Design a protein around this ligand. Structure first.
Ligand SMILES: [Zn+2]
Ligand SMILES: [Zn+2]
Ligand SMILES: [Zn+2]
Lengths: 81, 62, 250, 206, 161, 144, 43, 441, 77
RNA sequence: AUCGCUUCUCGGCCUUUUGGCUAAGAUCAAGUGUAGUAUCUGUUCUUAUCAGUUUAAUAUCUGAUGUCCUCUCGAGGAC
């Protein structure tokens, strides 16, 4: 399930369990570009969380270079809410 | 009518013959026939086809 | 019933084939399609690639491959050459013979560096003898048993095989030219077949293949079939620019 | 001298044969894509360069073994050996050499006042060199206007065997820091790079 | 269309069989539907060349072709049926011989020409295994003394060696 | 740096795309996906064409993992091989009698369309105009 | 894996193969095989 | 094969232009766009010669180009909307002679799509927000604030997704420190595709509409639609705020219209044509490009027409309303991709096919024996006028261009050893065959 | 099928997509509109047409955007 | 030669089937959560049209299965 309400300028973050993988491609490598999320899945208790685990925002969700070659990173906040 | 694919699943014979009829017409169309296409001027500044050119050529004028 | 009135719109396969401009395409279920004039124009476009066979079938994709026995994959030459396969066979037989206790003994005291195989053997295989495999161009989907289908539509006469030559009595190799097969003999005798009258036989209706021999024993060309006035059976049984590429490496 | 390359308006180049003694015009080999061509050129006996209305230039080559004389919709077809998105409608190609004794070239002249050349390579050393030059240049000096260079040059059909001299020639106008970084990846000196950049235009054009 | 692949060779594969069918003409069917037990070739097969005259001349040609090295015949699908034929024309070929002597029957051995071995040129005799003894009878009768190529024929039942 | 070993590996993937099992074809498809995204732009498109021939038949499939890895292989292969080739693979089954095949081809063509909807403008076929509509694009065949 | 070239059954493991060859449908197709076999063949 | 691609002569033809003090001074710079190129020229007032300072590659398509000035700063940023899913902000460094990327905002996918923004882009006259817009279903707005150190920032974007709607233009309306707001055209193909008869094809009306900010509540609210009489191409903005009224000139076929929402009764004017011309009884007339000189004293517009004729337009206005319109024939120059009307008394006429020109203004286009036209002058019949050679403008500069290069031929067709190029170029009456050579005259 | 809520949201997301019942009319009209949006976007096919007919870029894009409304005949029934 | 035996030789490939003894010399064998796929296994289908639903086509699903006498669902007939 996806948020997909369109993108913004607020970076996303990763818990430490979820540390390292891309958001969709589920890679572990060659991350190129930073993730951005929507205000609605940006506010409040959802500030600085794990887009996947829900855990605390510590490490930065990133985008596997394949995902940027196919521009699957131009859709917005992909938060599994 | 040959057993080419174009009629396969056409089982009634009048349909087959009209089908192969238009098919025949199209094959004769897209054939390049030098007899009617390939065309020759006589010396006299007027033109005929290959066929008629050789016809009157070898029956003693051209 | 409205589907049934559109079903009365569901025209005849002859309706289609006569309407259409390219009739090769028209197939069975084409007609139950909501827009057969489109469907057929599409299927008659250039370069397009038709649906697989097997959407009709009840069996799934290769459950029909289920039955048979199949031989293991065959490596590329330039990888056999580097002699890996024998290393691996030897290690295999070793470790299939060895017993559990000895297995753990070798776990605790390894045979470190049992073998070796040198680089530049590998790096030259992969970077100096790597070569284009056989590829199939746009369109030729693989379907079940395709590799079993032998091959067809070589109506050409000159097409000969080496096992063909051997099990027909003719020669294999550089002599597949200078060898007129046992069928060119009766080509010269009473003619080449009257559905391949657009085929000329080499040494019988064509000229001598490179350095052929005239004579009537085993191994020659015999009498090139000719009329009594001298004109051959057909063709000539006796025999009477600048292709440089533009961008090419030095 | 005796082959025809007809070029229709939408499908492609279509190689046609004239057999004089039977006096026939017969097809043997065409292309596998749609290409709205605007003008083509001959590079050899088997290779034809094409422009396209949407921006592209391509080079299409007959396979080396064509059964020239014989008697979906074709028998045997040609392949594509290069694919470049120029960027503007290219309205005339021509195989030519400019400066005296300069090696051959392709001049292309677009519809917006642009004129240029595509120039072969003679040595995998040259080839690999600029190949790496730009493969780094994309990564560390992307275009201004948001785009990606690989994707802009592979707008319609992907790139194949063309290097972007106009990205390479940007090393000059780059910054000393990056000039360093990249020429050090090449482990040549910015002198080595920039001279190898300039001279390749020197021996082909001006 | 339908041709009897007789003396159908065991290992002489239906694939090259159809490739020769094409190298002669309309390769439409090459089939030797064999024993339901063996799998190997069953001595007579059906070769369909979808043109009748195509199959006819292809048959005239692929007779005496050495299938499994042995002459096998494309046709319509040892008690002494050998005939001695002398005053023999030395100027013939072997497939010409098979087609000249096969008019009244099959040839279970092509005409073995008793030629001298010193040279390779014959002295004018041969013997030919035909299908039947009545076949050798009829052929040797129609060609008793009759017009051979250069030395008139003289044929009859053959001796045993 | 797969532009080197792509040739070595193809005959093994074609080997395992001619059946060996569900998981066999699921995994060979994943391999095709990643090869295509690596070799984007280096000209090894004949090899990915060859492997399209073998992957595309699995298009009618049911198991979620299998059909999913197939679809992934086709997005990768879309950037690496271009969208003409794949629109041509997707042409004939858009308007098919059936509905299982209509639906898979419209799923694919949707994903081919979303990404790279703008190339296709030069890849669409020529679709003749009947009586009361106009369907040809005369814009594109002005001569000049 | 294992096959029955008769019943065209594919098995992971031995126990299942042995239970297969303890004919129930193995038995049916087997007796049919024998029946059709004796059908076609029989100085 | 393995090829290397080199461009000898850049693209010359001009597509877009802006004018602003792109180096902070009050010497003005011009930023034009070739095809895939951003080129910046500075016109010297002394000779009248324009020096092409900076010519850069961008590897994309420039679909939209608009300069803007922050509220009170001395620089002139550039907002470029191109064919990537991004909006980009650019500046000049004369110190390095290079364009600099301030900010960068992704909003979607690449390529010249149809529902992804980038084709149209407008600003608010003061420099507070930008709107980016597609030709269907999508428009966004960005807010711009100086940071503490006055280095510009840009927050997340707003939304105006409205289905089944074209856009023939978008433009910022000049309000005075109110909420900024934008005038788009529109249309609605919706019904015309629900009607099996083709009736709704006809009988559909452009809707000159305004969306409005609400910077307090931070959203875009639909204020003011108004069904317009007939589709017209675009909308010239009326210098509002303090100067002038607000409002838009709708440039529709044959008719140019003032209009603003509120109390104003909407203002018309038919277009004056040239007299006794040789043009098809059917052929309409549309306003092609425009450029507005707004100065200390007053303001005015120039708009051009198909046969190349330029016109002057100023507003005859009472207290808060304007009252009537006067379009008076200025002169006729080449057909223009853009006009950029300088101070220092020139204007840049960006040709559309061939050599592009720099004229200097001689007389304000006022008070001579050329007639007077008006939106108040009633009539049954039209106006006319009779054109003439250059009266109010004087041809200072002439920059060459090959656009379009309709054909070529390489040869050595002078006795020289090296080859020349024979370029068949230019459109219609302004076409030519031109010789290129490697030498300098 | 919540996948479908998202997927006809995708149909609502991308004007020009399809589904298994889509009609030749919707298909070809969507491709026709897209063709127009790109003739406008790409600065050079505009010169191609401007020059092919004897029109001028304002004339060209005005035609195009008028045509964008019913490009391929009237609707289906 | 036969037939009875004796011995030996040979051939199969058959058959035989192991290192003795002790306290059978002693001892003992420690995996999930989720779904889901596939494979086995077990099982279940002649009935006669036609109408529809349905389906690419089948199928499925739904619905009934000529009158009159008469003798034993069955029969000869006016029809
Ligand atoms: Zn991802
Ligand atoms: Zn959200
Ligand atoms: Zn996490």
């Amino acid at each position: 399930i996806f948020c997909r309400k369109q993108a913004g300028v607020a970076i996303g973050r990763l818990c430490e369990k979820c540390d390292g993988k891309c958001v969709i491609c589920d890679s572990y490598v060659r991350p190129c570009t930073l993730v951005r999320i929507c205000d609605e899945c940006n506010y409040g208790s959802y500030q600085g969380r794990c887009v996947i685990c829900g855990g605390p925002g510590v490490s930065d969700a990133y985008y596997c270079k394949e995902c940027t070659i196919q521009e699957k990173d131009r859709d917005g906040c992909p938060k599994i809410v | 009518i040959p057993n080419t694919a174009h009629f396969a699943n056409v089982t009634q014979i009048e349909d087959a013959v009209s089908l192969w009829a238009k098919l025949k017409l199209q094959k004769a169309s897209e054939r390049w026939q030098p007899d009617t296409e390939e065309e020759y001027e006589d010396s006299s500044g007027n033109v005929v086809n290959k066929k008629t050119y050789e016809d009157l050529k070898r029956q003693g004028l051209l | 019933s409205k589907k049934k009135l559109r079903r009365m719109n569901r025209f005849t396969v002859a309706e289609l084939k006569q309407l259409v401009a390219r009739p090769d395409v028209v197939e069975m279920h084409d007609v139950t399609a909501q827009d057969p004039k489109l469907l057929v124009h599409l299927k008659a476009t250039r370069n397009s690639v038709p649906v697989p066979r097997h959407w009709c079938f009840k069996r799934k994709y290769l459950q029909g491959k289920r039955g048979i026995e199949k031989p293991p994959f065959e490596l590329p030459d330039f990888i056999k050459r580097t002699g890996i396969q024998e290393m691996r066979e030897a290690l295999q037989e070793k470790e299939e013979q060895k017993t559990m206790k000895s297995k753990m003994r070798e776990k605790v005291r390894p045979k470190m560096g049992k073998i070796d195989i040198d680089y530049q053997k590998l790096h030259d295989a992969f970077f100096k003898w790597q070569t284009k495999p056989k590829l199939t161009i746009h369109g030729d989907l693989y379907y079940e048993g395709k590799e079993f289908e032998t091959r067809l539509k070589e109506k050409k006469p000159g097409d000969l095989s080496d096992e063909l030559r051997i099990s027909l009595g003719m020669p294999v190799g550089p002599n597949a030219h200078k060898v007129p097969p046992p069928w060119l003999i009766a080509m010269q005798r009473y003619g080449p077949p009257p559905s391949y009258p657009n085929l000329k036989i080499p040494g019988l209706n064509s000229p001598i293949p490179e350095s052929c021999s005239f004579g009537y024993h085993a191994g020659g060309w015999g009498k090139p079939p000719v009329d009594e006035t001298g004109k051959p059976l057909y063709g000539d049984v006796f025999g009477t620019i600048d292709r440089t590429p533009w961008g090419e490496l030095e | 001298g005796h082959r025809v390359i007809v070029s229709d308006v939408q499908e492609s180049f279509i190689w046609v044969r004239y057999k004089r003694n039977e006096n026939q015009l017969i097809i043997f080999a065409d292309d596998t894509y749609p290409r709205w061509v605007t003008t083509a050129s001959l590079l050899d006996y088997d290779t034809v360069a094409g422009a396209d209305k949407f921006g592209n230039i391509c080079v299409v080559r007959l396979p080396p073994n064509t059964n020239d004389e014989v008697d979906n919709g074709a028998s045997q077809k040609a392949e594509v050996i290069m694919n470049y998105h120029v960027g503007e409608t290219v309205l005339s190609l021509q195989k030519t050499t400019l400066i005296p004794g300069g090696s051959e070239s392709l001049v292309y002249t677009t519809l917006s006042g642009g004129i240029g050349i595509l120039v072969p390579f003679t040595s995998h050393e040259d080839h690999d060199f600029f190949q790496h030059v730009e493969m780094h240049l994309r990564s560390e000096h992307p275009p201004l206007c948001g785009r990606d260079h690989l994707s802009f040059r592979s707008y319609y059909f992907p790139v194949k065997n063309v290097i972007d001299g106009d990205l390479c020639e940007q090393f000059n106008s780059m910054e000393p820091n990056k000039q360093k970084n990249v020429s050090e990846e090449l482990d040549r000196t910015p002198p080595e790079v920039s001279k190898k950049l300039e001279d390749i235009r020197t021996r082909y054009a001006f | 269309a339908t041709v009897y692949v007789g003396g159908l060779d065991e290992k002489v594969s239906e694939p090259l069989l159809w490739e020769l069918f094409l190298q002669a003409g309309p390769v439409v069917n090459t089939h030797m539907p064999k024993d339901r037990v063996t799998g190997q070739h069953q001595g007579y097969g059906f070769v369909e060349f979808l043109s009748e005259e195509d199959a006819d001349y292809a048959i005239k040609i692929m007779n005496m072709i050495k299938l499994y090295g042995k002459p096998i015949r494309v046709n319509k699908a040892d008690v002494g049926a050998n005939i001695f034929i002398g005053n023999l024309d030395p100027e013939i070929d072997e497939k010409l011989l098979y087609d000249t002597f096969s008019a009244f029957g099959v040839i279970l051995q092509t005409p073995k020409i008793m030629r001298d071995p010193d040279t390779g040129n014959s002295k004018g005799y041969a013997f030919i295994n035909f299908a039947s003894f009545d076949a050798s009878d009829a052929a040797i009768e129609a060609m008793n003394g009759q017009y051979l190529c250069n030395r008139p024929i003289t044929v009859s039942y053959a001796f045993k060696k | 740096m797969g532009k080197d070993y792509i040739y070595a590996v193809t005959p093994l993937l074609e080997d395992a795309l001619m059946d060996r099992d569900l998981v066999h074809r699921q995994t060979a498809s994943a391999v095709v996906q990643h090869m295509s995204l690596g070799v984007y732009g280096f000209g090894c498109e004949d090899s990915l064409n060859h492997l399209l021939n073998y992957v595309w038949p699995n298009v009618f499939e049911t198991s979620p993992h299998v059909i999913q890895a197939v679809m992934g292989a086709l997005e990768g292969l879309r950037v690496a091989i271009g969208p003409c080739r794949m629109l041509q693979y997707c042409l004939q089954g858009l308007f098919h009698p059936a509905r299982k095949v209509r639906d898979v081809y419209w799923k694919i063509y949707n994903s081919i369309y979303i990404g790279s909807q703008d190339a296709l403008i030069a890849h669409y076929p020529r679709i003749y105009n009947d009586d009361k509509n106009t369907y040809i694009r005369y814009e594109l065949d002005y001569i000049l | 894996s294992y096959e029955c070239k008769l019943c065209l059954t594919l098995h992971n493991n031995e126990g299942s193969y042995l239970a297969h060859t303890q004919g129930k449908k193995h038995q049916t197709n087997l007796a049919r095989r024998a029946a059709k076999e004796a059908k076609e063949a029989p100085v | 094969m393995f090829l290397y691609n080199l461009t000898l002569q850049r693209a010359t033809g001009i597509s877009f232009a802006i004018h602003g003090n792109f180096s902070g001074t009050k010497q003005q710079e011009i930023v034009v766009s070739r095809g895939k190129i951003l080129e910046l020229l500075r016109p010297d007032p002394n000779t009248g010669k324009v020096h092409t300072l900076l010519t850069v590659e961008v590897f994309g398509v420039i679909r939209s180009l608009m300069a803007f000035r922050l509220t009170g700063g001395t620089k002139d940023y550039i907002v470029v909307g191109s064919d990537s899913g991004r909006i980009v902000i650019l500046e000049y460094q004369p110190s390095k002679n290079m364009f600099e990327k301030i900010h960068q905002e992704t909003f979607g996918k690449s390529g010249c799509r149809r529902i992804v923004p980038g084709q149209f882009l407008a600003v608010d006259p003061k420099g507070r927000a930008v709107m980016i817009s597609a030709i269907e279903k999508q428009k966004l707005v960005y807010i711009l604030n100086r940071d503490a150190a006055a280095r510009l920032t840009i927050s997340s974007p707003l939304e105006a997704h409205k289905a089944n709607t074209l856009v023939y233009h978008v433009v910022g309306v000049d309000v005075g420190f109110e909420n900024p707001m934008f005038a788009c055209l529109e249309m609605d193909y919706e019904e015309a595709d629900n009607d099996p008869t083709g009736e709704a094809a006809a009988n559909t009306q452009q809707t000159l509409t305004f969306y409005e900010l609400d910077l307090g509540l931070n959203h875009v609210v639909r204020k003011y639609s108004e069904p317009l009489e007939e589709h017209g191409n675009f909308l010239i903005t009326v210098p509002g705020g303090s100067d002038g009224p607000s409002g838009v000139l709708i440039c529709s076929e044959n008719y140019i219209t003032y209009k603003n929402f509120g109390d104003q009764p909407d203002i018309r004017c038919p277009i004056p044509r040239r007299r006794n011309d040789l043009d098809d009884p059917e052929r309409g007339m549309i306003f092609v490009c425009s450029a507005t000189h707004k100065t200390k004293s007053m303001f005015f517009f120039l708009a051009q027409t198909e046969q190349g004729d330029i016109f002057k337009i100023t507003l005859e206005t009472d207290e808060d309303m304007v009252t009537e319109i006067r379009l008076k024939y200025f002169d006729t120059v080449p057909v223009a991709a853009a006009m950029c009307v300088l101070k220092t008394g020139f204007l840049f006429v960006a040709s559309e096919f061939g050599n592009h020109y720099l004229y200097q203004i001689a007389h304000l286009g006022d008070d001579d024996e050329e007639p007077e036209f008006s939106s108040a002058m009633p009539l049954e019949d039209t106006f006319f006028f009779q054109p003439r050679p250059l009266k109010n403008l004087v041809l200072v500069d002439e920059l060459d261009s090959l656009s379009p290069i309709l054909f070529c031929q390489i040869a050595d067709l002078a006795n020289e050893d090296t080859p020349q190029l024979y370029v068949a170029c230019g459109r219609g009456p302004r076409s030519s065959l031109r010789v290129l050579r490697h030498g300098l005259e | 099928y919540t996948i479908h809520s998202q997927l006809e949201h995708l149909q609502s997301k991308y004007i020009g997509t399809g589904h298994a019942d889509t009609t030749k009319w919707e298909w070809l009209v969507n491709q026709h509109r897209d063709s127009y949006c790109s003739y406008m976007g790409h600065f050079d096919l505009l010169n191609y047409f401007a020059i092919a007919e004897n029109e001028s870029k304002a004339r060209v894009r005005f035609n195009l955007m008028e045509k964008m409304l019913q490009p391929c005949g009237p609707p289906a029934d």
